[PDB]
């Protein structure tokens, strides 16, 4: 009850926990556990996570989740263990508890989970939903809305796979979705090599570090290659920019040139031969093909909403160049259609809001905040008295 | 040539014949299956032969009472001699494509990422091996949580495995109910009862013995038996008056075909002798 | 961690963060956070009137009232002075933080936000540790209903001060697992002679509060924590109030991780099984 | 005693996995663990029970097509007794990848097995009834080593906390 | 839904019946031996007129514990020569009353009895347990 139930939402590459009623998470932190090297024991209680974890180096990182998929059932639940004693602090026989999860885990992965929660920490009440029904739910707080509805399209890019994600009623079109490889890592290697070739004087020991922070602090989309290049090379006072990071190794400052990178690395999506070779084919008609695969019945609301979710959607315009190009690859075939040939096509939007970072995170407070979720959720008296068929199924 | 046209199956053929020849439902729109199906007598259903009639001939028989389940609709026809009774004879609307799609929202909450317009077809075929009605609900939920053997594996067209346990007999029964339903029946069985108890009293028990099912609905494995059973309690409950000896005399016998899946086809194709011209017949044709 | 933890991480964060994005000179952006400790304890971390340039942090107890009549008001008023404002509507307790003003060592101030809860539960202790020390005997009993469902029941002897906690346990495999850690604890001098002495009773008080209306039940346990005056003299007060207000929670954690380590060992033998059916299932 | 006991669950084990395909005769195109659903009496055999003591023991229900083991497990006390109940529930809540596991317990008993004609085809029957002594023989091993690790972290608990002080 | 509580099937004229119809060895002869320390020829005794055909538990479960009471009055060593004196027959009955004993265990009596079942096997092999099994008329 009066206290707001825990949100745990277990990513590919980062964590987002906090409790519920709450805007923003209350950690954000890396899912890898850093190991040593049963060690029953003193070797157990020894553990770090986040930015411990990482931090040394040698002691071996894991991902604790990965593809959203729990890596090894042991390390995931010692993962889980000092989420909930550390970090959030919470008694846990006293907080109903949201998880989150992926598209595509079987009922298997489900019991393996709920048994965890359930036997291992007593819990009240546990609720399993899939990542993005409540990231659809959570871009209800838009101002780009105006009625609420749960039928929409989900564009899920984390850190190891990026997922396109047609959804009805609160229920994955499992048949329908889509996987695509490329990510917030790959935009990573890329700009690595590409600043690896061109500025001089980079310890490569360090190269990723560097990298994720050039990224982080000056990447974005240019809406024309060729006419930005110019623009670099003609206006390059107020275009080109510098760097300043300090060597970790002999603690000393480097000072590195920031270029063409700026407008490339967004860019990739795109044009998919830059992300792979062997992506021949664009965003714009992999999630068109993703629509056009669902029922034409169905085929009106899913291109009138059309939500993102995860970082790797955080980069200035990417919204407004996805439309664009989406409007183009609609009206193409709607012309293809008349010319051949009558029904007007439907109007297509992408939401934007100021959450997208977290969206997911965002959904779980906001629906845990209400009384309802109280109502759905499963207590460990049914999970006694009924057992497994409880726990995989969502609440009637 | 037997042309038998059903809602959601048209079965064509010869004389003499086995099994249609072609088993493709037609695409004004019945003027356009003409196109399709004759190109590259008349059979009609109690709205040439009755059906009833068909269905029976093909077993050899003129009396008897036939349960006719196929895509679209099932009908309880007795039939008296050669003719039908076109006033004794029920409807049931219980159904395929519901238990289908029903069968496809439960797979969904055990969670498989079905969609119920591209798996349709494969869902279909998962119910046309496992899943159909049981005796009881709480016994069923015993064997379904309880040994492995419920939980069958059926392999995906893609590979993938799944497994399918309690919902084989989860689907039927929200039909049954009266609560899911909403509207309150019978079923089927109860309404083979009482068709044959409404009737006379001294054919009553020639109905009893000849009892012919037709239609692939009728193909599901137990149903002939599980009907048998439900006669048998039914007969106990209210004629027998729960005498123990009124049930050993009784006779039931549920005729159940190997080719009944298209017994009016069957029928009707060995009806039919040629006629020399068809030319002259026909007021059209004329 | 694996000590319970004086200091809230979560507050701990968050403050340290906010003061090293003000010392860096950024505009501060607005931060409203709503969470929970133990005990029923509510936290509610805000910038008051919207004026992110101000954090206040407050906090809400049911406590309240039995703290507040043994000395809560001198130590509070003793440790923050200044902080220490009006408190905010449907709290009890607010404590504001201009970043504009902020000290030299913020550390010790992060520190102090944290102590939040054991500082309030401190004057109770050290009220009786003075008693205690000044041999005023024979004085009512703190009795502290910390939870719901549990009792905390404080007296002071001529050589001794004894802690009495009456806690629940609710699911009845943990009972189990429970006895085992007492037993452990009551062999703990074995390995600590100069330790804290501890007694361990099930499903019935302790004689000395026999007279009460204690509860008995299945699902209880008294624990008593004897304190000599190598725990209640000057030095000792601080560490000993801070491990004995987390003792309870430290329990309660380490049942869990062996529950949990029990899952882990099992689950690695039955891939074991799984390993060896293969085995043993036919090749082709 | 250990020793002896097993031996005769094993000979007992022999002769009743001696299994066929069994049709249905009840139900038209069934197939059905006779044991298990035992709508035809004469296709059930004797059940026997083999215990080494007053608690521990085997029980063996055979058919025609199907064999059903039940297994009262070593029980010394209360940590020994809930180790147990969870290790078997354990097993039991993965009985379709431990698939000739029955999901709950023959009443009485800690654990069951059943062994179909579909396993004893697929499985060398000499292998699976090495594999219930087995099975036997190392649940007791690891509820043995289950109760020592609990006790050894319990001590290492105790130990760390009231060192502290 | 009550005329499906009625379980129609008990009354099925085509299920299976066995066939059935209407003492024991002599208590006092077994005393006899065993009081005179005549182990073998008390084991012979009690495996005497097996009530394979009474209805009543009473007398089969009389017969089975004048055979358990001699089973249990042997020494270890002493088992194999009685085991090996009694007929093919009188080892698979034997067989029976120990599968009958494992069901009433009580200090060490299943301790002797997993004795008796080993050189009972030797004697007669598992054809001998097969047949406790799918005995229709038994102990
Ligand atoms: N404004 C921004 N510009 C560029 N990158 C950003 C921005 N905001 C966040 N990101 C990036 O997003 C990444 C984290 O992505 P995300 O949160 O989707 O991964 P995840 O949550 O672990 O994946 P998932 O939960 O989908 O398994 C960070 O590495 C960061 O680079
Ligand atoms: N082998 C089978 N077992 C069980 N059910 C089946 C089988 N084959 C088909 N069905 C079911 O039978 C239904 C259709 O039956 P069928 O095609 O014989 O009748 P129909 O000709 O379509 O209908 P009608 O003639 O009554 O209008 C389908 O919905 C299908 O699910």
């Known amino acids: ?396 | 040539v037997v042309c038998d046209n059903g809602t959601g199956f048209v079965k064509c053929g010869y004389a003499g014949s086995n099994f249609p020849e072609h088993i493709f439902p037609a695409i004004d729109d019945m003027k356009h299956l003409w196109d399709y199906t004759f190109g590259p007598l008349l059979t009609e259903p109690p709205m040439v032969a009755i059906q009833a009639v068909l269905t029976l001939y093909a077993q050899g028989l003129l009396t008897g009472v036939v349960v006719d389940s196929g895509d679209g609709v099932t009908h309880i026809c007795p039939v008296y001699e050669g003719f039908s009774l076109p006033h004794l004879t029920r409807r049931l609307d219980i159904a395929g494509r519901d238990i289908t799609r029903y069968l496809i929202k439960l797979l969904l909450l055990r969670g498989y990422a079905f969609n119920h317009s591209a798996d349709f077809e494969t869902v279909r075929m998962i119910k046309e091996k496992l899943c159909y009605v049981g005796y009881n609900i709480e016994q069923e939920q015993k064997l379904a949580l309880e040994t492995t053997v419920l939980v069958e594996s059926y392999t995906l067209p893609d590979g993938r495995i799944i497994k399918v346990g309690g919902e084989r007999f989860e689907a039927p029964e929200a039909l049954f109910q009266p609560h899911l339903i909403n509207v309150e029946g019978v079923g089927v069985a109860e309404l083979l009862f009482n068709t044959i108890q409404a009737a006379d009293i001294d054919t009553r028990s020639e109905f009893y013995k000849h009892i012919v099912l037709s239609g692939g609905s009728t193909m599901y494995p137990g149903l002939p038996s599980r009907l048998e059973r439900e006669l048998k309690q039914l007969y106990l409950e209210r004629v027998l008056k729960g005498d123990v000896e009124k049930l050993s005399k009784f006779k039931i016998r549920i005729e159940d075909p190997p080719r009944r899946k298209h017994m009016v086809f069957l029928g009707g194709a060995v009806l039919a002798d040629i006629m020399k011209d068809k030319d002259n017949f026909w007021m059209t044709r004329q | 961690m694996i000590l319970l933890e004086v200091n809230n991480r979560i507050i701990e964060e968050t403050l340290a963060l906010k003061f090293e994005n003000a010392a860096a000179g950024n505009k501060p952006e607005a931060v409203e956070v709503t969470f929970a400790d133990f005990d029923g304890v509510l936290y509610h971390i805000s910038n008051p009137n919207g004026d992110k340039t101000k954090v206040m942090v407050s906090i809400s107890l049911k406590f309240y009232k039995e703290l507040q009549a043994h000395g809560a008001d001198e130590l509070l008023k003793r440790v923050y002075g200044s902080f220490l404002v009006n408190p905010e509507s449907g709290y009890n307790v607010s404590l504001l933080y201009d970043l504009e003003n902020l000290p030299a060592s913020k550390d010790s101030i992060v520190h102090q936000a944290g102590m939040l809860k054991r500082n309030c539960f401190a004057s109770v202790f050290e009220k009786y540790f003075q008693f205690q020390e000044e041999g005023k005997e024979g004085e009512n009993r703190a009795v502290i209903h910390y939870r719901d469902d549990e009792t905390m029941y404080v007296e002071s002897k001529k050589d001794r001060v004894t802690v009495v906690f009456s806690t629940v346990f609710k699911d009845d495999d943990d009972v189990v697992i429970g006895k085992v850690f007492m037993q452990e604890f009551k062999e703990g001098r074995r390995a600590s002679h100069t330790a804290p002495q501890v007694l361990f009773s099930h499903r019935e008080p302790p004689l000395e509060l026999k007279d009460t209306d204690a509860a008995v039940g299945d699902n209880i346990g008294y624990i008593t924590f004897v304190l000599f005056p190598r725990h209640t003299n000057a030095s000792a007060r601080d560490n000993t109030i801070n491990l004995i207000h987390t003792f309870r929670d430290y329990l309660h954690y380490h049942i869990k991780c062996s529950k949990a380590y029990i899952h882990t060992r099992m689950r690695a033998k039955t891939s074991d099984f799984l390993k060896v059916l293969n085995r043993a299932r036919p090749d082709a | 005693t250990l020793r002896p006991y097993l031996s005769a669950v094993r000979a007992t084990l022999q002769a009743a996995l001696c299994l066929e395909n069994f049709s249905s005769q009840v139900v038209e195109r069934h197939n059905k663990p006779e044991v298990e659903v035992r709508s035809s009496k004469e296709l059930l055999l004797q059940p026997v029970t083999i215990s080494r003591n007053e608690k521990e023991k085997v029980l063996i229900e055979g058919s025609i097509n199907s064999v059903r083991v039940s297994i009262a497990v070593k029980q010394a006390d209360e940590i020994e007794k809930i180790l147990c109940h969870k290790f078997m529930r354990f097993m039991m809540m993965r009985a379709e990848n431990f698939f000739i596991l029955r999901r709950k317990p023959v009443e009485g008993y800690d654990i069951s097995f059943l062994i179909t004609n579909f396993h004893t085809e697929q499985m060398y029957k000499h292998k699976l009834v090495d594999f219930v002594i087995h099975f036997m023989e190392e649940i007791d091993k690891e509820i043995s080593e289950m109760k020592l690790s609990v006790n050894a972290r319990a001590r290492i608990v105790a130990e760390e906390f009231l060192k502290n002080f | 839904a009550r005329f499906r509580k009625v379980d129609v099937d008990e009354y099925d004229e085509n299920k299976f019946v066995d066939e059935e119809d209407g003492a024991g060895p002599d208590e006092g002869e077994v005393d006899s031996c065993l009081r005179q320390g005549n182990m073998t020829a008390a084991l012979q005794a009690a495996l005497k007129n097996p009530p394979i055909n009474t209805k009543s538990q009473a007398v089969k479960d009389r017969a089975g514990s004048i055979v358990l009471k001699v089973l249990i009055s042997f020494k270890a060593n002493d088992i194999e020569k009685a085991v090996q004196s009694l007929d093919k027959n009188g080892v698979d009955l034997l067989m029976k009353y120990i599968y009958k004993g494992f069901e009433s265990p009580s200090d060490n009596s299943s301790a002797m009895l997993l004795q008796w079942h080993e050189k009972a096997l030797a004697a007669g092999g598992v054809g001998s347990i097969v047949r406790v099994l799918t005995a229709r008329k038994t102990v």
């Open chain 1, 1 to 396: 009850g009066r206290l707001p139930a825990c949100v745990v939402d277990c990513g590919t590459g980062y964590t987002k926990l906090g409790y519920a009623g709450n805007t923003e998470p209350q950690f954000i932190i890396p899912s890898c556990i850093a190991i040593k090297e049963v060690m029953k024991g003193v070797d157990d209680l020894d553990f770090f996570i986040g930015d411990e974890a990482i931090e040394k180096p040698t002691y071996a990182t894991k991902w604790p989740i990965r593809h959203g998929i729990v890596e090894d059932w042991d390390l995931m639940e010692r993962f889980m263990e000092q989420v909930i004693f550390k970090y959030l602090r919470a008694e846990p026989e006293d907080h109903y508890f949201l998880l989150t999860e992926p598209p595509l885990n079987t009922p298997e992965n489900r019991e393996y989970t709920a048994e965890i929660m359930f036997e291992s920490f007593n819990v009240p009440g546990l609720y399993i939903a899939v990542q993005a029904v409540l990231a659809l739910a959570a871009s209800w707080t838009s101002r780009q809305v105006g009625e609420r509805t749960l039928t929409g399209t989900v564009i899920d890019s984390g850190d190891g796979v990026t997922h396109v994600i047609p959804v009805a009623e609160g229920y994955v079109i499992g048949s329908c979705i889509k996987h695509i490889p490329i990510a917030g890592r790959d935009i990573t290697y890329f700009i690595q090599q590409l600043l690896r070739d061109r500025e001089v004087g980079i310890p490569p020991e360090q190269s990723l570090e560097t990298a994720k922070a050039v990224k982080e602090r000056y990447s974005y989309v240019c809406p024309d290659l060729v006419k930005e290049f110019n623009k670099y090379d003609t206006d390059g006072s107020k275009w080109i920019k510098q760097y300043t990071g300090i060597n970790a190794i002999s603690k000393k400052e480097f000072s590195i040139d920031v270029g063409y990178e700026r407008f490339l690395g967004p860019e990739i999506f795109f044009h998919p031969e830059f992300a792979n070779p062997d992506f021949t084919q664009p965003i714009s008609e992999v999630v068109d093909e993703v629509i056009q695969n669902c029922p034409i019945d169905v085929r009106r609301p899913l291109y009138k909403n059309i939500v993102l979710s995860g970082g790797s959607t955080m980069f200035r315009d990417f919204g407004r160049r996805l439309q664009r190009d989406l409007k183009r690859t609609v009206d193409a075939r709607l012309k293809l259609s008349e010319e051949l040939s009558k029904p007007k096509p439907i109007d297509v939007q992408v939401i934007t809001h100021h959450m997208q970072r977290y969206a997911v995170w965002f959904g779980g407070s906001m629906l845990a905040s209400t009384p309802e979720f109280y109502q759905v959720c499963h207590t460990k008296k049914d999970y006694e008295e009924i057992g497994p068929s409880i726990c995989r199924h969502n609440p009637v």
